[PDB]
């Protein structure tokens, strides 16, 4: 199950309108209180009018709406089950504006919801754009509207949440398809659960920011249930998904062909391990005792060229283990890994102990010291996040998490780690005064400007429970060494949520749950629009445009020339991300130094070090003096 974010509104006084209704299947059947009676559009003898179909509610009064429920026809028949939909609010009944929520509902008879940010409204409208099976009708047994306890206008200058994207599944794993710009999400063998999988199947779903279409697809070709895996975008631009429910499998997603390809089996079966792309396009993985057994799982490395997994037994997991109470089952999970110089992998935590992993010969691991500051040695921060916001200066921001995977209090601790040469002890200091809010299970993304957006989580880690939620996101401004609270959202994002940067510079935040019958499944996502996209008036700012790119594929050391429509002040490269269970080893930012060629023409050099400019796909963003970013240009960086 799922749940609405508010309280059901009294349907006493309501006035409802439909595009059609078959006698017996009248509009009002939908708000009668009887799950046995439903509204149904014309059929048979009345004809079969295709969708869109519409349900308009006049609540007669103004309420703080925050959601809606749609209980499908419970008579064993599928006819009229809403797939694609859009929800609109209106204070007047004429001017609706943009949908507050849209996406697709899974084809089943469970109550479906639309949770959205609170908005004062008198009129509601649900548009059924499609029928779950491609049929013409639309049926609704019961429809409810929810209200917030109160309404608080988002404050100016602190970004905005919305709209909500409804999905058929809990997006507990997501990636950005670099070629398409689509957000790819996967759950498990089921749309709402992982437990009891026969393995070999994965439900996936894609959201296209450009069209707003949510398209779903079952993957079986790779004979893998991709729940609880390792994710890395290799040197080739292919997404490497490893283990999880099918502990030894590897599945390869090729954005280019929009296809899933079976990969080689890992040497060791793992679940909940982290994997990281190396300076040579290879993928390194270590740990993962959630599945495939609980024992010391040393490193192994994947060669996209030979399509082999090679064990690196001397790349020892032991030094990176946290002191988790549940033991190894959790202690080797979600390592904060970063591919660095010369085939090295840096492990920034969660363990207090940081380490250098080497991939030559049978591997090696060297101690890089302890995460600490003037405030002390940092404790284990299981499920804390780690973001490399300046790969040129080797700057990594770390924050939140807790000593144990669950039933532990989250921290406010935040640190800056500055990496040097592999084998050396990096410098670590405290970040400002730490987070405004302790959190675990939160997610984060590095934005075009080098700031880090941090959202969701809870104060105390209790998987599948929406307790002690943090609704206030924070942004860390490196230049200022300051954290800034942003406008709060309304939907809890704890265990199993994700965040990804979209090519347009907005953040996609979604998921949480995946616990079957629980009422904590969130079959949605929301868009956060950072303040850099607005002007003072609260309207959207005008964005520089990249009118030209000399090439869309460059070698490390390579030079790119672009023309813009306006004079640009700054530019950055951001590696395409992948995310699951707080881990995102693919994203990183490179601040570029621009050569002003006159006539709004500029050139920049891509770092010559493939351990900085890890190969794969990147997004190029230009900023005007105002600080407004362009939408990204996609650049393939090859070694
Ligand atoms: Na009814």
| Distance (Å) from CA 109 to ligand 1 centroid | 14
Q: Classify each residue of 190-215 as buried b or exposed e, where b means 16 or more C-beta atoms within 10 Å of its C-beta.
A: bbbbbeebebbbbbbbbbebeeebbe
Ligand 1 midpoint to CA 17 (Å): 15
The residue among 574, 594, 592 whose CA lies nearest residue 584 is 574
Q: How close is the Cα of 141 to the center of ligand 1, in Å? A: 4
Q: Ligand 1 centre and the CA of 209: distance in Å?
A: 35
Query: Distance between CA atoms of 400 and 415, rounded to whole angstroms?
Result: 10
Distance 69 CA to ligand 1 centre (A): 13
What CA–CA distance (Å, rounded) separates 442 from 385? 8
Spacing of C-alpha 207 from chain mean position: 12
Question: Under a CB-based contact definition with an 8 Å cutoff, are residues 442 and 398 in contact?
Answer: no
Helices (H), 447-555: none
Annotated binding residue 334: no
Instruction: Tell me the chain's radius of gyration from C-alpha atoms.
Output: 25
Centre of ligand 1 to C-alpha 124, Å, is: 18
**Is residue 581 marked as binding?**
yes
Structure tokens at 540: 């959207």
Query: Rounded to whole angstroms, how far apart are CA atoms 457 and 89?
Result: 29
Question: Distance between CA atoms of 593 and 607, rounded to whole angstroms?
Answer: 10
Query: Which one-letter DSSP state was computed for residue 508?
Result: E
In the reported structure, the alpha carbon of residue 73 is separated from the centroid of ligand 1 by a whole-number distance in angstroms of 9
Cross-strand pairs, 485: 474
Spacing, Cα 35 to ligand 1 middle (Å):
5
Q: Assess whether the previous peptide bond of 487 is cis (omega < 30° from 0).
A: no
* 40 has binding-site annotation: no
In this structure, what token pair is assigned to residue 599?
Answer: 């006539």
Cα distance between residue 297 and residue 564, in whole Å = 49
- ∠ CA 533-537-543 to the nearest 5 degrees? 30
Give the helix/strand (H/E) hosting 590: strand 589-591
Expressed in angstroms and rounded, the spacing between residue 597 Cα and the centre of ligand 1 is: 67
Name the 3-class secondary structure at 27. helix
Q: Which of 459, 454, 433, 451 is nearest to 443 (CA)?
A: 454
d(CA 164, CA 101): 4
For the chain, how many helices (H) and strands (E)?
1, 49
Q: What is the DSSP string of 420-457?
A: -STTS--EEEE-TT--SS--BS-EEEE-TTS-EEEE--
Q: Which of 115, 218, 176, 94 is nearest to 466 (CA)?
A: 115
Q: Is 484 annotated as a binding residue?
A: no
Which approach determined this entry?
X-ray
588 neighbors 610 (Cβ within 8 angstroms)? no
Spacing, Cα 55 to ligand 1 middle (Å): 14
How many Å lie between the centroid of ligand 1 and the Cα of residue 560?
A: 62
Q: Report CA(90)–ligand 1 centroid distance (Å).
A: 24
Please report the DSSP string for 544-565 in residue order.
--EEEES-SEEETT-EEEEEES
CA angle 365, 370, 375 (to 5 degrees): 170
Indicate the length of the chain as a whole number.
Answer: 639
Q: Determine the topology of domain 154-541 in CATH.
A: Methylamine Dehydrogenase; Chain H (2.130.10)
Q: Two tokens at 463?
A: 């998987």
Distances (CA, A) of 483 to 279, 375, 427, 472, 619: 32, 18, 21, 12, 25
Dist. CA 469–CA 526, nearest whole Å: 16
Report CA(142)–ligand 1 centroid distance (Å): 5
Ligand 1 centre distance from Cα of residue 83 (Å): 19
Nearest to 284 by CA among 71, 14, 30, 270: 270
Report residue 534 as tokens: 């607005």
8 A C-beta contact, residue 83 and residue 35:
no
Tell me whether domains 1-153 and 154-541 share a fold. no
**Closest listed residue to residue 585, CA positions, set 280, 357, 345, 365:** 345
User: What is the CA(34)–ligand 1 centre distance, in A?
Assistant: 4
Instruction: Give the rounded distance of the alpha carbon of 193 from its chain centre.
Output: 18
Work out whether strand 633-638 and strand 553-555 pair parallel, antiparallel, or are unpaired: parallel
Domain range 542-639, its CATH number among 1.10.10.10, 3.60.150.10, 2.60.40.10, 3.40.50.720: 2.60.40.10
Distance CA 279, CA 609 (A): 8
Domain 1-153 class?
Answer: mainly beta
Strand partners, 414: 399
Catalytic residues: 495
For 479, counting Cβ atoms within 10 Å of its Cβ (0-12 exposed, 13-18 middle, 19+ buried), the class is exposed
Cα torsion 49, 54, 60, 63 to 10°: value is 170
The gap between the terminal CA atoms of the chain, to the nearest Å, is: 47
| 260/251 Cα distance (integer angstroms) | 7
Report the alpha-carbon distance of residue 65 to residue 81 in Å, rounded. Answer: 24
Contact 152, 158 (CB under 8 A): no
Q: How many other CB atoms sit within 10 Å of the CB of residue 519?
A: 11
Any idea where the domains of the chain sit in the sequence?
1-153, 154-541, 542-639
DSSP labels for 74-94?
Answer: -SS--TT-B-EEEEEEESSSS
Contacts of 196 (CB under 8 A, 6+ apart): none
């Amino acid at each position: 199950a799922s749940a609405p974010i508010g309280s059901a509104i009294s349907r006493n006084n309501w006035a409802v309108t439909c595009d059609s209704a078959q006698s017996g299947n009248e509009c009002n059947k939908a708000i009668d209180g009887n799950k046995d009676t439903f509204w149904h559009t014309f059929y048979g003898a009345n004809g079969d009018p295709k969708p869109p179909h519409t349900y308009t509610i006049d609540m007669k009064t103004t309420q703080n709406v925050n959601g809606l429920s749609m209980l499908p026809r419970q008579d064993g028949n599928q006819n009229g089950w809403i797939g694609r939909h859009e929800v609109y609010l209106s204070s007047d009944g004429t001017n609706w504006g943009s949908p507050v929520a849209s996406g697709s509902w899974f084809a089943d008879s469970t109550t479906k919801y639309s949770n959205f940010e609170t908005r004062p409204a008198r009129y509601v409208r649900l548009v059924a754009i499609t029928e779950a099976n491609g049929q013409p009708w639309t049926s609704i047994a019961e429809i409810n509207v929810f209200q917030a306890s109160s309404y608080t206008a988002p404050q100016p200058g602190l970004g905005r949440w919305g709209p909500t994207i409804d999905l058929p599944i809990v997006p507990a794993a997501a990636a950005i398809e670099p070629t398409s710009g689509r957000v790819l999400m996967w759950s498990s063998y089921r749309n709402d659960a992982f437990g009891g999988s026969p393995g070999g199947i994965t439900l996936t779903s894609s959201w296209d920011p450009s069209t707003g279409i949510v398209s779903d697809r079952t993957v079986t070709v790779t004979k893998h249930d991709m729940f609880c895996p390792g994710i890395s975008m290799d040197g080739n631009g292919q997404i490497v998904v490893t283990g999880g429910n099918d502990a030894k499998k590897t599945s390869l997603y090729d954005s280019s062909s929009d296809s899933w390809i079976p990969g080689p089996d890992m040497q060791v079966a793992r679940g909940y391990q982290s994997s990281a792309t190396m300076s040579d396009g290879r993928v390194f993985t270590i740990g993962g005792s959630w599945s495939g057994g609980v024992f010391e799982k040393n490193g192994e490395v994947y060669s996209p060229s030979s399509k082999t997994w090679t064990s690196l037994p001397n790349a020892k997991v032991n030094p990176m283990l946290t002191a988790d109470k549940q033991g190894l089952y959790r202690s080797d999970n979600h390592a904060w890994l970063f591919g660095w110089k010369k085939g090295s992998v840096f492990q920034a935590g969660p363990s207090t102990a940081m380490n250098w992993y080497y991939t030559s010969g049978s591997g090696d691991v060297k101690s890089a010291g302890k995460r600490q500051s003037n405030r002390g040695v940092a404790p284990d921060a299981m499920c804390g996040n780690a973001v490399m916001y300046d790969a040129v200066k080797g700057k990594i921001l770390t924050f939140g998490g807790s000593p144990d995977y669950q039933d532990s209090d989250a921290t406010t601790n935040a640190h800056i780690i500055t990496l040097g040469e592999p084998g050396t002890s990096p410098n670590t200091v405290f970040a400002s005064n730490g987070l405004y809010f302790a959190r675990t299970f939160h997610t984060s993304v590095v934005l075009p400007d080098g700031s880090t957006f941090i959202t969701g989580g809870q104060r105390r880690g209790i998987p599948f429970e929406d307790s002690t939620p943090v609704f206030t996101p924070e942004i860390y401004v490196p230049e200022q060494d300051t954290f800034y609270k942003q406008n709060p959202n309304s939907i809890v994002r704890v265990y199993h949520s994700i965040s990804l940067l979209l090519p347009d510079g907005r953040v996609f935040n979604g998921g949480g749950g995946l616990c079957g019958d629980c009422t904590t499944n969130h079959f949605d996502a929301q868009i956060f629009t950072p303040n850099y996209l607005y002007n003072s008036n609260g309207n959207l700012a005008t964005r520089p445009k990249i009118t030209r790119t000399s090439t869309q594929s460059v070698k490390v050391g390579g030079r790119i020339t672009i023309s813009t429509d306006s004079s640009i002040s700054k530019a950055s490269l951001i590696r395409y991300g992948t995310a699951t269970h707080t881990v995102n080893t693919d994203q990183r930012r490179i601040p570029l130094t621009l050569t002003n060629n006159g006539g709004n023409s500029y050139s920049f050099q891509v770092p010559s070090d493939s351990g900085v400019a890890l190969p794969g796909y990147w997004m190029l963003f230009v900023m005007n003096s105002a600080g407004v970013p362009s939408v990204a240009s996609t650049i393939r960086v090859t070694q």
